[PDB]
Amino acid sequence: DAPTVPKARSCPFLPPDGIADIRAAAPVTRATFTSGHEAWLVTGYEEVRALLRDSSFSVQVPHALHTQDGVVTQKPGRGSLLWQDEPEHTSDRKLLAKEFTVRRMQALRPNIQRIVDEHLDAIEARGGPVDLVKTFANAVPSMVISDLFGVPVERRAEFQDIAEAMMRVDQDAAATEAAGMRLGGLLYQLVQERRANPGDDLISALITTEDPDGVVDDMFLMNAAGTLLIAAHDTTACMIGLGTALLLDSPDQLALLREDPSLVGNAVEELLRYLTIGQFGGERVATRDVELGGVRIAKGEQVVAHVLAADFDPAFVEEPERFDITRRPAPHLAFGFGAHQCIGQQLARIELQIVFETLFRRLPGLRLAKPVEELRFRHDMVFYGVHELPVTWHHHH
Ligand SMILES: CCCCCC[C@H]1C(=O)O[C@H](C)C/C=C/C=C/C=C/C=C/C=C(\C)[C@@H](O)C[C@H](O)C[C@H](O)C[C@H](O)C[C@H](O)C[C@H](O)C[C@@H]1O
Ligand code: HEM
Secondary structure, eight states: OOOBOOOOOSSTTSOOTTHHHHHHHOSEEEEEOTTSOEEEEEOOHHHHHHHHHOTTEESOOSOOTTSSSOOOOOOOOTTOOTTOOTTHHHHHHHHHHHHSOHHHHHTTHHHHHHHHHHHHHHHHHHOSOEEHIIIIITHHHHHHHHHHHTOOGGGHHHHHHHHHHHSBSSSOHHHHHHHHHHHHHHHHHHHHHHHHSOOSSHHHHHHTSOOTTOOOSHHHHHHHHHHHHHHHHHHHHHHHHHHHHHHHTOHHHHHHHHHOGGGHHHHHHHHHHHHOSOTTOEEEEESSOEEETTEEEOTTOEEEEOHHHHTTOTTTSSSTTSOOTTSOOOOOSTTOOGGGSOTTHHHHHHHHHHHHHHHHHHSTTOEESSOGGGSOBOTTBSSOOBSOOEEEOOOOO
């Protein structure tokens, strides 16, 4: 039996302790995963990039290595992207990217600022202490993406609850699929509504997009909306609560940011790299024999791109365990790489910049109200983070 992949973190803001020696000795190696299956663990930065850029790997993998039962949940089809291979991944991503453009992400900045300031108004009005996860981290990115999609305000809490029920590694396939099925009911209503009553929203723009092959039908819209809505809710929330917790535990770094809000672009790149919240790694399967880091991977063999390990490779950046927001941004792997690299990463960066800049400006003396060693971290979720973050700040006399 290949050694189990290290999971335990003695420092909750760092990778599992065992990872570094594995990456150093054998950045492509056999390991046993949570499901009990053996597969290839890829931990080295250059090798994860090579893995992710190689189009002979498929995302239609045989096992769910990160769940106990190993059962692969039934994934949505065309429009969802994450679970598609070329050539349909390529054409369908192009259709989505025609309307979900980086310039349109950029044009969300004033709305995202308003949402942030509104949730901080509510925090100041209630006074401290507060749990920043429930009052701010989960709520803000939900409002941003729900506004882009014209999701009625009374349904948004249900979307948030689906991400909490669905994006887990501590349950069986039946539980995960039931939450996926409830999400389909919400997506079906939303697509029907946009078709019936088009508006200034992203589904309505996709409905009218150039579509010579007639691929944009309701199932495609539901699948695209589901992937975008859930990814945008869960990942960004996790980064907000965890990057906040890390800065609140990093006094020299938080002082630099407080001195200079214009460093927040560098700080968000370093937070993404350092926290790499996709903690268990991306799964792929070889569709032909390939050589990866000089190791033969056989057709049909599953492989895990451990982006958290890769972002701590000392060959990628100097002293990678040092959290340093003054570093020049480098091309970390927090959004993946190659064909599947995050289509939403510019919107994610914009949200994080506005969130962290405004948060640390507007709550003077923000600081933890519960020590890190007592927080509940997300070892049980696909995306890492904290389940709660109690904070306090200077009182407004
Ligand atoms: C490189 C390191 C990162 C690895 C990340 C690994 C991480 C990931 O890729 O995250 C994305 C990057 C961001 C998350 C996106 C989430 C998308 C959810 C979309 C859901 C769509 C649902 C509909 C259309 C329903 O109508 C029909 C559908 O068929 C119902 C299914 O049941 C839904 C599945 O349950 C969803 C599945 O559970 C999510 C994966 O589990 C996410 C994965 O685990
Ligand atoms: C900080 C927040 C985010 C992180 C860390 C993140 C991470 C990632 C990663 C690692 C992947 C690639 C998965 C793989 O290769 O298997 C990805 C893909 C994807 N993400 Fe993001 N994501 C974030 C925010 C967003 C947002 C805001 C959106 C939507 C607006 C979004 C939409 C998507 C979609 C649709 C894909 C699939 C792209 C494809 O398969 O071609 N994500 N994300």
